[PDB]
Amino acid sequence: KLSEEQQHIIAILLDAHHKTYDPTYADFRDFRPPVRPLSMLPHLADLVSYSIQKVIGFAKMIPGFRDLTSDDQIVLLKSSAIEVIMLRSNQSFTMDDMSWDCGSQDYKYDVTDVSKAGHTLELIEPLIKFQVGLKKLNLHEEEHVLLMAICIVSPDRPGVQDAKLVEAIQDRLSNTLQTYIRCRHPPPGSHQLYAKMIQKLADLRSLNEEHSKQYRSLSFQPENSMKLTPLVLEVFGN
């Protein structure tokens, strides 16, 4: 039985996502232009920096997130940012040509664009496999926003101080998701869906680790760091 509180949580997270995800991609006009030599790094750095801002806006609305300390909020957002950005991007991902389609040919990104921002197949191949496996789950929007929120509020992130409180907040979201699947996701799509969604969170930890490796090699070169944004430098490191 989906309790009234659990329905409330889902409503909050759906609204938070709708307030922090613009499916018209209007703000892409503001980014440095894509050029198709790490020719896509300025554009995709701007895209990521933009997405970081939106992920923070979503995080602030997760029930219980505001009850954490400032330090724990920062630690969770720093460690989860690239994972939530990858999850968030799955909305625009299409399996029809394995690309992130953001409304325009100019704003349609394939594996070549990603390598033109400085990343390598060590990241890109598992990243495509993730996007495909996530897309095949055909998540309800309710489950998509719950998974983003569970990803953010993870008690085993490095540098978490109040792990017991983070865990208490995550457990409320996890039980909401488990009960939503049981009561609202019909079979056969519901089959071991919770375990499959948690497996995706495990995949994101591995993607996070490889992204940070490649980011460090990328940003170690000052010529590359010059093309990043100040927010990206603060979040992913200097």
């Binding site: 602030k60 400032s70 909020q73 920062i74 100040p230």
Partner: peptide, 10 residues
């Protein structure tokens, strides 16, 4: 330390 993160969180 994290002034832009902290400002976007307020």
């Amino acid at each position: 330390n994290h002034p832009m993160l902290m400002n976007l969180l307020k």
